Design a protein around this ligand. Structure first.
Ligand SMILES: [Cl-]
Ligand SMILES: [Zn+2]
Length: 380
């Protein structure tokens, strides 16, 4: 079908790609470097950024938490306008990136009016933003900000809060703990199938590219765990994951996201890692939705898993089992019971879904609360 695709961020990719950073920022810029909990200090990544920019007018602002608080981001907005920062540089992961996107937009929001209507409008009304770039220590318009003061977390998208550039050096991913490496692989995999294992619309390029991402993650994802400092492996996983999060594969095709929406309630209620909730929900959801997803499940089985023999139901069953096994071999269990959850929380989960308006989920808008109930139950 029809689509509007825009991917303006310049990618600087590869070993030592930070060598390209300095030339992207005006020599006379006043740069604010933003970061999270301080691990980038310990790894030496922040020092590499500081060295790359040596001689330039550089300031620092850290402490951006996972689920960046509206509190802290406003403090940065304060420093920015007070010190007349002209460029923002996010160093870290998606949390640092997202919070920095908000700072960039909030800063050119008018003087007096409150920046929270960025979130109320999903960034629809952003006309301009402080230029920003990033140095990503793992793959990441699109930012989810929390007020935490009573537990908010809304999203916003704007063609202006998109980074002008992103430095992606696979070497910076070598230090990620196995838990984070596996979670990243699962999350990339699921972001891809949220946009591919849906309904056939004869979007051949989108299908091939999605298939390509999945095949790459299955081949090199496990290797990233076994061989954490294998550059080629870590590079393929980083670049594949970037495409899984990026836009080409979703442009003009049906999108699901029900696995994400169901998974989100497991994180909110039980504190499970994002990717753990996806590994649990996806295979249960696929079995439940095997009717509407039938054609793309069979295409997935053939194109990604080389499953060609047997009935349609046998092929789909084998594809679901192969996917489950892939997640488990990455060290990411796929049943609620693996995490000590017996399913007694499902009534509370369904109440939260209803509270959050998640009552018509999926590409067919047909995953109602009774369907979500069956999916959680099957995931036990
Ligand atoms: Cl210079
Ligand atoms: Zn995700």
């Amino acid at each position: 079908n029809n689509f509007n695709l825009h991917t303006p961020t310049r990618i600087l990719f590869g070993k030592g790609a930070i060598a390209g950073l300095r030339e992207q920022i005006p020599h006379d810029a006043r740069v604010l470097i933003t970061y999270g909990g301080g691990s980038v200090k310990k790894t030496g990544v922040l020092d590499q950024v500081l060295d790359a920019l040596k001689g330039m007018d550089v300031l620092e602002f850290g402490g951006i938490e996972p689920n960046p608080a509206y509190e802290t981001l406003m403090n940065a907005v304060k420093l920015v306008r007070e010190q007349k920062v002209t460029f923002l540089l996010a160093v870290g992961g998606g949390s640092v990136l997202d919070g920095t996107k908000f700072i960039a937009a909030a800063a050119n929001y008018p003087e007096n009016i409150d920046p929270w209507h960025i979130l109320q409008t999903g960034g629809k009304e952003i006309k301009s933003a402080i230029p920003m770039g990033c140095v990503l220590t793992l793959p990441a318009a699109g930012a989810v900000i929390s007020r935490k003061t009573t537990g908010d977390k809304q999203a916003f998208h704007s063609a202006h809060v998109q980074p002008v550039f992103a430095v992606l050096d696979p070497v910076y991913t070598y230090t990620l703990p196995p838990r984070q490496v596996a979670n990243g692989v699962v999350d990339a995999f699921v972001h891809t199938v949220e946009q591919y294992v849906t309904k056939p619309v004869d979007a051949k390029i989108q299908d091939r590219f999605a298939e390509g991402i999945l095949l790459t993650l299955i081949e090199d994802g496990p290797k990233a765990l076994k061989e954490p400092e294998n550059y080629d492996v870590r590079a393929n996983v980083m670049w594949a994951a970037t495409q899984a999060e990026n836009g080409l594969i979703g442009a003009g095709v049906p999108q699901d996201w029900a696995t994400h929406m169901l998974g989100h309630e497991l994180t909110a209620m039980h504190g499970l890692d994002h990717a753990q909730t996806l590994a649990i929900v996806l295979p249960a959801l696929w079995n439940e939705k095997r009717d509407t997803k039938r054609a793309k499940l069979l295409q997935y089985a053939e194109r990604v898993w080389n499953i060609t023999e047997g009935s349609d139901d046998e092929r789909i069953d084998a594809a679901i089992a192969a996917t489950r096994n892939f997640f488990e071999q990455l060290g990411v269990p796929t049943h609620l019971s693996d995490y000590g959850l017996d399913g007694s929380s499902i009534p509370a989960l369904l109440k939260k879904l209803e509270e959050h308006g998640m009552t018509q989920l999926g590409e067919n808008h047909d995953i109602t609360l009774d369907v979500s109930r069956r999916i959680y139950e099957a995931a036990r």
